[PDB]
């Protein structure tokens, strides 16, 4: 047992490692979206940069789980990062609907881990998840939800002018 | 094909996608080293931070290939990022030796790509490789060799004091 | 021969003179586009200014060739600058389409010159072309391609509101 | 007819297009002199720069005619730019004598245009020519004449020492 | 083999050692010229300083080759530095003609090395030579050629007044 | 005879030329040490920089004798610079020991020259040697002797940790 380990159940250590992988998968999916919107036949650079920023955010979240593992005396165990669901993301509305889906998947995993930490009576892990993940997760979901509503208002996917205006004004 | 595409061979497009993935693989390997040296039973923080910074470098190299692909009108195609070779890296010397081997693997892949771009008569790709990758590769390989020489001079793996001193004096 | 001349083939000297003339031809073509978009019955000032800047860019590229010729001990021989292919450029999308074609023509000529320099074993001329022309060319081609994608998304050529939006938001 | 056009005769419109071309032809001749004085076997750098500056001045004059045409609702029509009269310019005195003749040729054409504008009762065109062209012409002719006087005083064309001193002291 | 060595042919390693000796030889020749123009019976101090600065430049070039050798895992092997070809250099024109001959000799040796590096498929070596040597060589040759033309215009070697003026106006 | 020459014996003139060469010989020897400690299988950067600095110092000493020769109306006569005694310098201790013997050799040559200048009754030469050479010689000899004592206290050649520590602490 690690000399620093105290009140840190094996189940939670395994769950932290799975959560880290899921954060990396999300980061990679966001990188794919960045690359798509940067294509010459797509050309929505502000949208591309939005997704690049979220890729970086999700990578930072995974790195925080690595540091957390070590702080508690757990051991980081890495797995392969699966390639994203799609190679092409259709348009701004499809990609944002996919980001909403992804965010909710990550959120549900964090809520699952929080419930496990509550059940194992690990208040440090609960506090970490509340402070560093749950809040930002709700904020991100709301932001993307707001975007979806505006994209639909702007006539997406049919309305090319509306897609241009979104890139210029909602993610400028 | 893409309206921007000019003098960009399909073999080179494909090789850029493979190169991007190898850079991500190297980034992930370095992240594993960072997490190892941050363990409470290893605790070499400066060494940990050295590998963290190299994980950042390799990820930036991958992103530059993504951007490059789009510039030339190629299409980014992502694959799975394989987990690193080891979960545990032994000590600073073993880790640096592993790092040297990784850097020489990435370097050979970049030289292989440069030769393909040469055979295919693509000066833009050659120049990109020369400026953005080839010189940093040689620099990074020289630094790591220098580190290995010093670690051996310090009596690694056996000399714990030598290892402590390297971490305080050789890395940032 | 000139006292400074070394490893500079007569074919490369002649090709540099042709390349200089092609750059002046390109500069003159962009000048015509500037004057078209500045007409009272066209009146897209930011579009006009975009072509004015590219006119000034192409003229600088020709000037760089003149200086290069003297540096290597070659002799600048000027020829007539042909008038542009059109007096009127239709609209922003037709003009960008023509600019893409022109940039690809200039790019192919630079690529042909690099191939000659390679074959004639002139690495100074190869390096000049890579560092001063090839990089800029690919960037300019990517930007124009992105513009055309967005112009099509905005409903050009028929959609005047789309063309107005482009002038206000994509160029500047 | 253009919505903005008022008191702008077709003869004046046509003459502005011819004037535009002449200014470009002057600019190109000056470019040729710059390239000549930058030759390794000529090497009078300040003389070269003086001619480069005049090339720039004449191009700006052409551009101002383009803008003027549009302001009045005339239509820019571009023609081939003829290559300069010579490939090599002999020496500073011969180039300066050539420049004086070019400058008087452009001046006469501006004077003939002003006479046409007067005859056609176009005071706006008269005022434009007076403010933007006629004054600069007389100043340039005076400067070049002064230079020719000094080059002869210095024993050009035979006195190489005089030519060197001119390049160091009379041109900036 | 050195642990850092990769894609670095022994022929190139040998050629790098020969190249740095040649740079040292050129440095020493320039130092001799410095010492000659500082003589009380020559007394052309700005000419002397020009040669001193070029001696320093060529010394730095050799040192860059030593650093390069180590960066690639090659081994610096030093040889004797031959004394310069002459003990006295006649006058400014003779010395600049000698400097041109020397610069073209160095340039040819660099071009030979680039060709060897191309043949051995070493793009790292190619890029180094292009960026750090070939560009500056061409600039140095042009500058010296320009000076020769000017010394000949000023009546060298016969014209003592001309030589005085060159020292006061073309150098320092 | 030079118009400036006064109280300057031919024997002393020749001795200054011999002294110049030995300073160059010393500079080249320190350059060799610089390159050795910069090897990837040696990698003591601070020690390498120490020897680079002393290489610079001896070069400056050689230049100063060239200038002195000219000030007195003597004539600089250059001879070949012999390659250093060794291609490889063992370790910091061996290198410092070799540096001490080299410094002693240069110092004996300067004392011999001072003695000749004394016998030939040349106080200007005596004074030049005292102020510009003899004091820094004694300082440099004391510094290297101090280094050697410390390297021995540190347990060189065998104590690798001792060598690492000296590089981090005794040299700049
Ligand atoms: Cl416990
Ligand atoms: Cl769209
Ligand atoms: Cl009217
Ligand atoms: Cl210039
Ligand atoms: Cl000629
Ligand atoms: Cl190899
Ligand atoms: Cl150059």
From Swiss-Prot, chains A, B, C, D, E, F:
Binding site for Fe cation 2: 58, 103, 137, 140
Domain Ferritin-like diiron: 6-155
Tagged with keyword Chaperone: no
Keyword Metal-binding in record: yes
GO molecular-function term, one example from the UniProt record: ferroxidase activity
Superkingdom to which the source organism belongs: Eukaryota
Name of the top EC class for this enzyme: oxidoreductase
Entry-linked InterPro entries: Ferritin, Ferritin-like, Ferritin-like_diiron, Ferritin-like_SF, Ferritin_CS, Ferritin_DPS_dom
CDD domains from the UniProt entry: Ferritin
EC assignment: 1.16.3.1
Comment field (misc): There are three types of ferritin subunits in amphibia: L, M and H chains. M and H chains are fast mineralizing; the L chain is very slow mineralizing.
Similarity-based family: Belongs to the ferritin family.
Subunit-level organization: Oligomer of 24 subunits. The functional molecule is roughly spherical and contains a central cavity into which the polymeric mineral iron core is deposited.
Summary of the function given for this chain in its UniProt record: Stores iron in a soluble, non-toxic, readily available form. Important for iron homeostasis. Has ferroxidase activity. Iron is taken up in the ferrous form and deposited as ferric hydroxides after oxidation.
Protein name according to UniProt: Ferritin, middle subunit
The organism's taxonomic lineage, starting at the top: Eukaryota, Metazoa, Chordata, Craniata, Vertebrata
